[PDB]
């Protein structure tokens, strides 16, 4: 009953659409059929056995269904059977009242603080359709012949208002639609079996703004000039957040604000014509882009005159306070009237920088502002131009990923199908080429990192008289030696990861140790891909500036274009050494920096591990019992303080010091201390949500550590060394058959240990390795690093999905209940043939590759399809379909390295999803696999002092309202219970936002520590002041009318 | 004398035609017992529309109290055939002179039928 299209089951093959239309009009009412479509297997001469018919009125559909149920429809000795359809032939509302024809459409914004509206461009004779089922509103505008479709969703609007144009308060002749995001823009492009009753033989493709003055891209509100309607209010009452009030408006001549440039929503620089600062102008642009102040409300002479000469810090404070306003501000002048060095230190201490983030949409551009984030290497030697760096991300109107249909839509022209570039493709190319101009600056393309390539992000630097973009590009290195488009971009963008600055080493003491290569069965297998060698003195020097006590045996390092992990040795010659297969590109600098040294975190079981380990002989009872004991120990963590410390010491961080961890071992009852009890509750809720979203089993008998090799050559093919630290469980009972107590803190493993990574789609990755104990190996002193033999038929990383020794993490587990009887050969690791050009890069093919990365990017769907096929078809990871999916996944992973598209077939789509997924809109099927059993089990289980305090509370609530947080828990823990339309589909952006907010709260805590240290400077007096603060905050009578925060005294 | 007897309601027709001049296979689902049935029927002589309700009975002989190999006055679509395949939710395969019948139900419902035996098919559309 939701739709009006009815699918006919069987029709004769010899009939045409006209005959069926005549039959339906004869049996039913006259001209009661709107659209009739008969699918054809061939182009125009082979119709199918069924057809779909769209009716004008639901009453006609009900009558047709009643006739079909009684078998009263007989057309050419065939009984027509009627069934519901999936989608409508034409997106047209059934109700004739919602259809508005020949109405006046205009755009604008609340230019004035009073009840005034400005009209930029007005369109006449437009068509408006309201689709309640689709939750969207369509506007058809005819301009220069070809028509355009404007699509506005219900989530796009935030408030609905009604106005009048004739000037009568009683009459309603206008409607306001306040838009939070931009509307989608389409364009029309240019029979025997398709009647359609009209000229609907075309297709819609997404396009950019079609207005000459680009009024759509600079307008955040829409006004609908329609005739007075007695029942029109009922139709307009269906829009979300409708106000039942009467409002009047007046037209303001705002045709002057018209920009012909690509970047429409930015202010004109020629209007000011003065020495206005860049930071204040950028903040004002960010305010205008946000739904706080309209364009004209901030373009007046009085506001800029007031903001021109003042105190810079006070101006920034008032601007950010205005940004923190909960509602929309109409008069900024009244608000600002009523309201009235360190960067280098931050970079050297914790690499804290203020980087501008920009979002580019097909309609407009949104400026987020100077958000704090971790600094990279490129800004260490260019810290003076902190504001010149800006992060640009290309997203949709909903700040989501660009769909593949919006760029390079396929079309069959000629004998072969050739994709056709859309206007969005050209817009992105023009933005990348010409650049983005913000005030007295023009940003230029520098490079993009590997992570940013998968998130459609890119770095832009504003050219300056001192250093330009090309200067930085040539300072990083010479990239003309690389003839591959993808390889050159990867090498140029690889030097953008967060790192810690260390000492500088010249190019006088560098070794050239030869590598080892083995060629067996006509395949080139190289053991040394990114392995290296380091000395003890170098480790001591590099561990002094990072505040690291223990010296790891392996740590990832990159410098001067080299990249790879290095291992310690007891027979080193000098401080540094290097191999041959490590030089990526030549560079003019050799700055040393370290990203990660060692992380002995407990291992976790992801979905792919269980999926690939469910065929070797592992039963469902083991996983069910493990999940049961995990939920039992999770539920007991609340009322038992003993389990809290054990969980915190075995879930996140083997040796981590925190205020909650210290109080867990020795504390009061869980009923008391709300600051800790509510944190425990929210942590449990987060764990439950993570378990529901994906499988993550906490296994205490396994770790996640990187691996290296030693220059010994004693271990054979199948013999490795396993050594890790001892946790609470290991220390409590160290007596085990496969566990050797080599040291008090380090325990050796002699059990069967397998190696697994995060992406795994082949049954042959499971390689059982027997760990052995040798005195010679222990004499070298290897810790937190598994040892790989030098000699063998094939290297271990090659069998691990064709990996390399580039500091990648490895999953290890000294388990004994696994089944090692079955062994499968690994898949081939040979990649595609590299593509080499005959000419140097002219900064255009790199842009083409960057834009084409969005198109045919099927990396995220291959894993889902593989999981669905494994859950549906029994004997998973054995059929050729799983092998093909694994090969496609490997090719898609290799796409970032070499330009080889994945080419996902259409017939491989699952078209069905299990219960344990967030795709509620998609059909859901009950799964009977091990994952289904685990999800069902989880579901069953589930079913002086005052001033500082006020300042801290004001800062905390300002951060909460800036990031949208409404409670202290979600901003302190960094996990938000509420999600946007784009933060829930992907996890990389949410993780980046969580890291940014964690950095912000850490900076706030550091500032609080500095304030506390400077306030007293006396030990006993500091203790007394802390006790007094705790007493004041603990007393309920000391709370004022405002929200008193109890997270201030908790500092250690 | 009647082994199996239940009310059946037709669901769909294989040809879905009125004057196809061909034997039509019907799909009827039993009430209560919920047993799916396939049967080839001639629509021209015995019309059967979708949604109609008819009873079905099976007896080894049409005589009263024995005499294998007077129920003619009660029903109107009597047929004669043999059961050749019993292997399956057990199902039966009875051919009435080339007109195949597939009675798929429950193992407990069908337990008193032997292999290679002659049985009749009594039908009435209420």
Swiss-Prot record, chain A:
Miscellaneous note of the record: RDR2 is non-functional in the absence of associated Pol IV.
Family to which the UniProt record says this protein belongs: Belongs to the RdRP family.
One Gene Ontology molecular-function label: single-stranded RNA binding
Catalysed reactions listed for this entry: RNA(n) + a ribonucleoside 5'-triphosphate = RNA(n+1) + diphosphate
InterPro entries cross-referenced by the UniProt entry: RNA-dep_RNA_pol_euk-typ (IPR007855)
A GO cellular component entry from the record: nucleolus
Free-text function comment from the UniProt entry: RNA-dependent direct polymerase involved in the production of small interfering RNAs (siRNAs). Binds to single-stranded RNA (ssRNA); engages ssRNAs longer than 7 nucleotides and initiates internal to their 3' ends. Able to transcribe the RNA of an RNA/DNA hybrid, the transcript produced by Pol IV, if its 3' end is accessible, to generate double-stranded small interfering RNAs (dsRNAs) precursor essential for establishing and maintaining DNA methylation.
Gene Ontology BP annotations: defense response to fungus; siRNA processing; siRNA transcription; siRNA-mediated long-distance post-transcriptional gene silencing
Observed phenotype of the null mutant: Late flowering and absence of siRNAs derived from FWA tandem repeat regions. Loss of de novo methylation. Increased expression of retrotransposon-derived solo long terminal repeat (solo LTR) and SDC due to their derepression; levels are even higher in the double mutant rdr2-1 jmj24-1.
Assembly and oligomerization: Interacts with NRPD1 and SHH1. Associates with Pol IV complex, forming an interpolymerase channel bridging their active sites, through which the Pol IV-generated transcript is handed over to the RDR2 active site after being backtracked, where it is used as the template for double-stranded RNA (dsRNA) synthesis. Interacts with JMJ24.
EC number, as in UniProt: 2.7.7.48
Subcellular location: Nucleus, Nucleoplasm; Nucleus, Nucleolus; Nucleus
Protein name: RNA-dependent RNA polymerase 2
Chain positions recorded as Mg(2+) binding sites: 804, 806, 808
Keywords: Magnesium, Metal-binding, Nucleotidyltransferase, Nucleus, RNA-binding, RNA-directed RNA polymerase, RNA-mediated gene silencing, Transferase
UniProtKB/Swiss-Prot annotation, chain B:
GO CC annotations, alphabetized: RNA polymerase II, core complex; RNA polymerase IV complex; RNA polymerase V complex
Keyword Chaperone: no
Pfam families reported in the protein's UniProt record: RNA_pol_Rpb8
Subcellular location: Nucleus
UniProt GO MF annotations: DNA-directed RNA polymerase activity
Keywords attached to this entry: Nucleus
GO biological process: DNA-templated transcription
Subunit and interaction comment: Component of the RNA polymerase II, IV and V complexes. Associates with the mediator complex.
The protein's name in its UniProt record: DNA-directed RNA polymerases II, IV and V subunit 8B
Annotated source species: Arabidopsis thaliana (Mouse-ear cress)
Source organism phylogeny: Eukaryota, Viridiplantae, Streptophyta, Embryophyta, Tracheophyta
Gene encoding the protein: NRPB8B
């Amino acid at each position: 009953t939701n739709r009006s299209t009815v699918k006919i089951s069987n029709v004769p093959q010899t009939i045409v659409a006209d005959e069926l239309l005549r039959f339906l009009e004869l049996h039913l009412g006259e001209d009661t059929v709107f659209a009739l479509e008969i699918p054809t297997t061939r182009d125009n001469w082979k119709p199918r056995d069924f057809a779909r018919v769209q009716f004008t009125t639901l009453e006609v559909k009900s009558r047709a269904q009643l006739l079909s149920s009684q078998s009263k429809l007989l057309f050419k000795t065939h009984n027509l059977r009627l069934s519901e359809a999936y989608d409508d032939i034409i997106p047209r509302p059934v109700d004739p009242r919602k259809r508005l024809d020949d109405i006046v459409l205009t755009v604008g914004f609340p230019e004035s603080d009073e009840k005034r509206f400005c009209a930029l461009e007005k369109w006449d004779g437009v068509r408006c359709w309201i689709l309640t089922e689709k939750r969207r509103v369509e506007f058809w505008v005819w301009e220069s012949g070809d028509c355009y479709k404007i699509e506005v969703r219900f989530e796009d609007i935030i408030e609905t208002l009604s106005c009048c144009v004739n000037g009568d308060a009683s009459e309603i002749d206008a409607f306001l639609l306040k838009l939070k995001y931009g509307p989608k823009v389409f364009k029309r492009v240019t029979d025997r079996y398709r009647f359609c009753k009209e000229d609907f033989d075309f297709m819609w493709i997404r396009t950019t703004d079609f207005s000459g003055s680009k009024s759509i891209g600079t307008s955040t509100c829409f006004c609908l000039e329609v005739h007075n309607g007695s029942t029109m209010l009922d139709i307009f009452s269906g829009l979300p957040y409708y106000r039942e009030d009467t409002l009047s408006l007046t037209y303001v001549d705002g045709k002057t604000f018209a920009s012909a440039a690509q970047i429409v929503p930015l202010l004109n620089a020629a209007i000011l014509g003065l020495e206005f600062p860049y930071e204040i102008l950028f903040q004002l642009n960010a305010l205008v882009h946000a739904q706080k102040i309209s364009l004209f409300a901030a373009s007046d002479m009085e506001l800029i005159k007031i903001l021109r000469g003042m105190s810079l810090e006070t101006a920034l404070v008032i601007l950010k306070k205005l940004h923190q306003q909960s509602s929309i501000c109409y008069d900024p002048v009244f608000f600002v009237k009523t309201q009235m060095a360190s960067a280098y230190k931050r970079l050297t201490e914790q690499n804290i920088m203020s980087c501008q983030r920009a979002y580019v949409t097909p309609s407009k551009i949104y400026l987020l502002g100077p958000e704090l984030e971790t600094a990279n290497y490129v800004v260490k030697n260019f810290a003076e131009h902190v504001s010149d760096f800006m992060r640009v991300t290309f997203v949709e109107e909903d700040w989501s990923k660009l769909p593949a249909n919006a760029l390079s839509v396929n079309s069959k022209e000629g004998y072969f199908v050739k994709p056709s570039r859309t206007n969005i493709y050209n817009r992105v190319l023009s933005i990348l080429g010409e650049g983005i101009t913000v005030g007295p600056k023009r940003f230029e393309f520098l490079a993009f990192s590997a992570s940013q390539l998968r998130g459609n992000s890119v770095w832009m630097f504003a050219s300056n008289e001192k250093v330009k973009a090309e200067d930085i590009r040539e300072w990083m290195g010479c990239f003309r030696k690389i003839r591959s488009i993808s390889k050159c971009a990867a090498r140029m963008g690889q030097l953008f990861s967060a790192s810690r600055q260390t000492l500088i080493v010249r190019a006088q003491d560098v070794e050239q140790i030869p590598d080892i290569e083995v060629t067996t069965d006509g395949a080139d297998y190289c053991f040394s891909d990114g392995i290296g060698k380091i000395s003890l003195a170098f480790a001591k020097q590099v561990a002094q500036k990072c505040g690291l006590s223990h010296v790891p045996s392996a740590f990832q390092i990159r410098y001067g274009g080299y990249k790879g992990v290095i291992a310690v040795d007891r027979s080193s010659f000098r401080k540094l050494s290097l191999r041959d297969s490590m030089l990526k590109f030549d560079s003019n600098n050799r700055m040393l920096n370290v990203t990660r040294w060692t992380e002995s975190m407990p291992c976790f079981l992801n979905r792919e591990i269980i999926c690939l380990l469910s065929t070797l002989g592992i039963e469902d009872a083991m996983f069910e019992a493990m999940q049961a004991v995990h939920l039992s120990m999770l539920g007991n963590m609340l009322e038992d303080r003993d389990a809290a410390l054990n969980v915190l010491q075995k879930l996140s961080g083997e040796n981590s010091k925190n205020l909650l961890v210290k109080m867990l071992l020795q504390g009061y009852a869980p009923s008391s201390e709300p600051y800790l009890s509510m944190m425990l509750r929210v942590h449990h809720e987060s764990q439950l949500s993570e378990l529901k979203s994906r499988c993550r089993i906490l296994v205490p008998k396994g770790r996640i550590l990187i691996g290296c090799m030693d220059e010994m050559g004693i271990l054979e093919y199948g013999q490795v060394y396993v050594r890790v630290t001892l946790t609470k469980a290991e220390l409590k009972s160290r007596d085990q058959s496969y566990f050797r107590k080599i040291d008090e803190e380090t325990s050796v493993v002699i059990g069967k240990v397998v190696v697994t990574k995060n992406p795994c789609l082949h049954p042959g990755d499971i390689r059982v390795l027997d760990a052995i104990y040798e005195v010679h190996f222990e004499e070298k002193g290897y810790l937190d690093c598994i040892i790989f033999p030098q000699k063998g038929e094939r290297p271990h990383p090659n069998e691990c999905s064709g990996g390399d020794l580039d500091g990648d993490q490895f999953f290890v587990s000294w388990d004994e209940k696994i089944i090692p009887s079955e062994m499968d050969p690994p898949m081939d690791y040979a990649g595609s043939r590299p593509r080499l050009m005959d000419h140097d890069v002219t900064l255009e093919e790199i842009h083409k590759f960057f834009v084409d990365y969005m198109i045919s990017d099927t990396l995220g769907v291959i894993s889902t399809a593989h999981l669905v096929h494994a859950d549906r078809d029994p004997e998973k990871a054995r059929s050729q379909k799983c092998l093909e999916l694994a090969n496609l996944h490997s090719r898609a992973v290799d796409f970032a390295k070499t330009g080889a598209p994945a080419e996902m077939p259409y017939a491989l789509k699952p078209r069905e999803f299990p219960d344990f997924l967030e795709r509620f809109e998609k059909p859901t099927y009950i799964s009977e696999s091990v994952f289904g059993k685990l999800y069902r089990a989880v579901k069953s289980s589930l079913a002086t002092a005052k001033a500082h305090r006020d300042m801290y509370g004001e800062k905390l609530t300002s951060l909460m309202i800036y990031y949208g947080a409404a409670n202290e828990e979600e901003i302190l823990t960094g996990i938000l219970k509420t999600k946007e339309m784009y933060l829930a589909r992907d996890n990389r952006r949410y993780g980046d936002m969580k890291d940014r907010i964690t950095l912000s709260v850490k900076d706030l805590h550091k500032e609080a520590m500095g304030w506390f240290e400077k306030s007293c400077e006396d030990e006993q007096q500091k203790k007394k002041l802390a006790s007094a603060w705790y007493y004041v905050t603990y007393n309920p009578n000391h709370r004022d009318e405002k929200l008193t925060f109890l997270s201030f005294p908790w500092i250690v | 004398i009647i082994m199996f007897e239940d009310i059946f309601v037709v669901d769909k027709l294989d040809p879905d035609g009125k004057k196809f001049d061909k034997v039509t296979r019907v799909e009827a689902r039993s009430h209560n017992l919920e047993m799916f049935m396939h049967l080839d029927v001639n629509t021209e002589v015995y019309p059967l529309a979708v949604g109609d309700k008819f009873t079905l009975a099976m007896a080894p002989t049409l005589n009263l109290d024995g005499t294998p190999d007077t129920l003619a006055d009660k029903y109107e679509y009597i047929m004669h055939g043999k059961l050749y395949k019993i292997s399956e939710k057990a199902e039966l395969y009875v051919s009435f002179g080339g007109l195949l019948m597939l009675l798929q139900g429950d193992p407990a419902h069908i337990s008193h039928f032997e292999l290679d035996q002659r049985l009749f098919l009594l039908m009435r559309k209420l």
